[PDB]
Symmetry: C5
Subunit: 105 residues, 5 copies
Amino acid sequence: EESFYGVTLTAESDSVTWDVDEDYARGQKLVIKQILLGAEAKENEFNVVEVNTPKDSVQIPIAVLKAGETRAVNPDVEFYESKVTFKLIKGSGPVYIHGHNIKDD
Amino acid sequence: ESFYGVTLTAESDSVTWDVARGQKLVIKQILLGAEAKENEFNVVEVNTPKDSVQIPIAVLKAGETRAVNPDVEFYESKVTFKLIKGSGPVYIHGHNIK
Amino acid sequence: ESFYGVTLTAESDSVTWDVRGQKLVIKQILLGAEAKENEFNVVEVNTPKDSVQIPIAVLKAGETRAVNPDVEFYESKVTFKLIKGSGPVYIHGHNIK
Amino acid sequence: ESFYGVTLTAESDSVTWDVGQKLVIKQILLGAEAKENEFNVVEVNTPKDSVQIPIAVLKAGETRAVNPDVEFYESKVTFKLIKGSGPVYIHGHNIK
Amino acid sequence: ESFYGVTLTAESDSVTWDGQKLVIKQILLGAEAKENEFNVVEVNTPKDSVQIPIAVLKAGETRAVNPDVEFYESKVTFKLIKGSGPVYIHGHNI
Ligand SMILES: [Mg+2]
Ligand SMILES: [Mg+2]
């Protein structure tokens, strides 16, 4: 009951929302395993991804990357039955978000 | 269960988690903010009375260590996280699961 | 049930997995010691399931030696391609049913 | 279960874990006060499985932390700071 | 059921593990490892016909890797094909 999750964020397309079948609580969970900075990212430019979840008054950066210092982070965080939006609030990317898209429990 | 995300700064250096049965807080990542002062050590200390422990779980510094992934858990416990060194910001990520 | 270990290089820049309940877990992507200093090595994962195509590893001698995607692919073929760099790059994981 | 957090320093270089009990070591972290460029090595000793070996090699300026994610189902386990003055922090948990 | 911890060096550049399974959690470079020297650990598992580096370490760049790979019912041999180490391999057998 899983599917690979892989989305890309850029200055031009800075947001991605996960909301698998809006309102229906069947145990769906999104697990974010890795957030990776693209090879083309300008050296020394901070790239920050912020995660947003209304369900928990949540708004906080989950990744701070910079070519030359931090190429990737492995949050291994999860979001359960909730609408989650990832936004590139700093930098032009690209930034890739990888994880597990769990359909139910 | 629910995502856990709190921010610590010089202006607000402490947060507490106090729920109960079967509840556990898993701390997956502690990340240093982009604005953090270069070469400034930022230390997050966890305090858990129940398990008689007060110890740093993150030592970060722009230019050396941007993040740590403790992957530690606090089962059926009240827990306080404090930024005891540095001005931050520092982000603590995890989730609660019963 | 079986260890998965494949090598990608400029000469052999692509590998495909066709294995049903069969699943492929990718645990680590590692840059070889002979990889050129300062050369970006990018591995792209591709799968017909959900039309997937995205880099899953960006490596570079002197900056990033390895990544741990810890991602999985279920009942579907998966192709890994070294779209940038000459490697060698190693992909590690396992196949389980 | 219970959280496991212990500190090792030159002045207090060893800690022993005693009592299906399993000790899982998740992270070994180098303290901010650790001398720059100083190697700090934590050795583990688990007789039940016959193994004395370093499980962490840290150094300010190079490696701030390691995530062993190793477990000892075994009885008693001793961690010792065999190199360096620390402080070094060991985090994990005891699971019944 | 048991902690696995072995050391590889130029002098002792081989280790053999011969329901049984071996999970490799961490491969760590020793403090005495020569600065800037590449240390490569190759795993060889006959059952799946794989011989491939599982760790590439170097003092000053990469102190450790966390493969988190597993080997199901099979003989496994780890060889330090490059470098003098010491290199430590940690995990557990089930
Ligand atoms: Mg924008
Ligand atoms: Mg303070």
